[PDB]
Design a protein around this ligand. Structure first.
Ligand SMILES: [Mg+2]
Ligand SMILES: [Mg+2]
Lengths: 369, 367
């Protein structure tokens, strides 16, 4: 008898939901679904994911991740994939713990360090404040790459306020030495013509990464931008469907692919996207926008994949922006030294969810009958 | 007129939506069936905050902007919740103007030819032949759809030989004036799909629905290109950019959006219009007798490229126990094989108070 999945448990609040899997012999692993409306994701997982997993071989993640999107074929898109990513990440943890190895080792890497870029999420902050803040971060933690925001999120061509973009790009560049890589993200702001003009201005100021210039669901628009520019154009964080990834990569719509491990549905599906990209010659620089487990999943992936991109996205926002990210874990795995994060040799994900966070969570369980 | 309150009334299968304006006018619609109590929570948390306080008559603004406000949730549930709001706002306008929804969208009250649509793979070919003959005798249907293959079957039939037998068995049981349609529900790869479709063509079948994984447009396109029988699809497609591509590709002969899975009337009319420009008929998917069949009836009374018939589920209580007693007066009477859109304002139905009383209710109110 191979180990079977006996119980699937969730521990949630509106923001974050952890997933705990237990086998019929008592071994466990912990994962997490995508943050945001996590309490709803939890319900989807019990209702639409768990019925297909209970009683199944616990080590056969490929079966589950392959079959459940077809069992629930009337539900294409985000919520199902978010729920599946919780089960997948918990199962990889379970395996790591069984084998006594970190997830990066199971998927072909080794523990060690990863270059991080400090990622700013605010469009609210003035250019001068953002330059100040990033400079202080560079001094304190040693970051040698940063990402800041331009345009307005799905802004249909409009900036956050008049002139913010023209100001911020050279203000940050001025504050930072040429040894510091600068990245920007437009959050689907521009049509292609405008996106190209903005991109030529980025190229005048030593910016090296241009993320989501156009509505992300319009591949042709993005492809027009990639083709017209020299700056690397990057995208993919909201793309949760493998057939969509195959199409984006066939079209070479971007220079760099940026799946989000939780939005895409877990490590297994992310590894398939990274391989598709590797076959086409494209680096994979995953999206990780907060300090829930999404960052640590990404750290393990970047230690492993042959076409890992240049750095880990590492959110530098504090408690005003992500108050729900504080005290998720017994010990933070996110200490940065000399601009680098570290994957340790601890088994599985190598973290423990805070008992203080768990006491107050909404718990739900599905058990194999 | 502004949207003051958005209410849902749900169980696990069906959730109705009631919108009230700040001057007290109301309209009723429905989200897509299934996990409907999860869809209700999505509606309150991710749709209603963008609608409260907004002009009640401007449905275009809402259905256009909400998918962008919630761009982190591409896919089904957001769209299911949006269709609840859209259909209730169309009923509200219909009631305000004293007109059925079909008149608001350029059509007229009247009849629609229906096809009796079987959902079962369980049933033997002879039993399906018997049940359908009986339905033709009783109700006058002159078209039927039945199932072949297995749902998302990866090339396997429901049991060996079911498909080879059912196709000629139903064709032999039905007068030549009865049209026969099939649905493979994503069973086949293209090569197998072509071989099956060559058999359908030789056996008087005239409509071949979803031969391949719906998500693989190039596979379906290969089948459409190899066959003479009309290939059809679209019921799970809820993204307009995906519809654009499907149509531009001519991946199918006939598009079959589902008004509720796609996100309501305004969005389905955009799809229908994209199809009309590419010269494709639109024969929407409607698989149960919740309000989705009545929405489709009004759309087919109005759209210039309406396909041949309305999909009309012929399943009973054993398959859809949850659809009984939804409405005070059923809009679903069939005479001589046809459904009827009446001149009653809006959708022309009222949700049963007996169903409402046991529903789970939730409200979002403009502050
Ligand atoms: Mg981004
Ligand atoms: Mg169908």
């Amino acid at each position: 008898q191979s180990m079977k999945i006996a119980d699937i448990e969730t521990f949630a609040n509106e923001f974050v939901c952890f997933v705990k899997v237990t086998t019929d012999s008592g071994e466990t692993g912990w994962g997490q679904v995508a943050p945001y409306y996590a309490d709803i994701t939890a319900q989807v997982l019990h209702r639409q994911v768990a019925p297909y997993a209970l009683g199944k071989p616990a080590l056969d993640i490929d079966y589950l991740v392959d079959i459940i999107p077809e069992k629930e074929h009337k539900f294409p898109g985000s919520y199902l994939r978010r729920a599946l990513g919780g089960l997948d990440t918990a199962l990889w943890d379970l395996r790591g713990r069984l084998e006594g190895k970190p997830v990066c080792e199971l998927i072909g890497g080794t523990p060690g360090t990863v270059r991080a870029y400090g990622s700013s999420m605010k469009r609210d902050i003035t250019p001068k404040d953002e330059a100040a803040r990033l400079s202080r971060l560079r001094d304190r933690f040693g970051f040698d790459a940063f990402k800041f925001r331009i345009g307005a999120e799905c802004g249909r061509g409009q900036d956050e306020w008049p002139g913010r973009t023209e100001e911020i790009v050279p203000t940050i560049r001025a504050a930072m030495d040429d040894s510091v890589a600068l990245l920007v993200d437009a959050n689907s702001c521009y049509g292609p013509e405008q996106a190209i003009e903005v991109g030529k201005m980025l190229e005048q100021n030593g910016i090296s990464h241009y993320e989501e210039p156009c509505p992300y669901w319009e591949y042709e628009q993005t492809q027009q931008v990639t083709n017209a520019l020299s700056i690397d154009v990057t995208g993919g964080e909201q793309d949760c469907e493998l057939q969509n990834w195959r199409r984006m990569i066939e079209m070479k719509a971007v220079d760099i692919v940026q799946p989000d491990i939780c939005y895409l549905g877990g490590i297994t599906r992310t590894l398939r996207v990274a391989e598709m990209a590797h076959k086409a010659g494209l680096p994979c620089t995953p999206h990780a926008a907060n300090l829930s487990m999404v960052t640590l999943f990404t750290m393990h992936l970047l230690r492993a994949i042959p076409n890992a991109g240049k750095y880990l996205e590492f959110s530098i926002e504090g408690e005003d922006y992500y108050p729900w990210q504080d005290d998720l874990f017994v010990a933070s795995p996110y200490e940065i030294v000399d601009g680098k994060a570290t994957v340790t040799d601890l088994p599985g994900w190598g973290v423990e969810v805070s008992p203080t966070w768990l006491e107050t969570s909404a718990h739900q369980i599905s058990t194999w009958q």
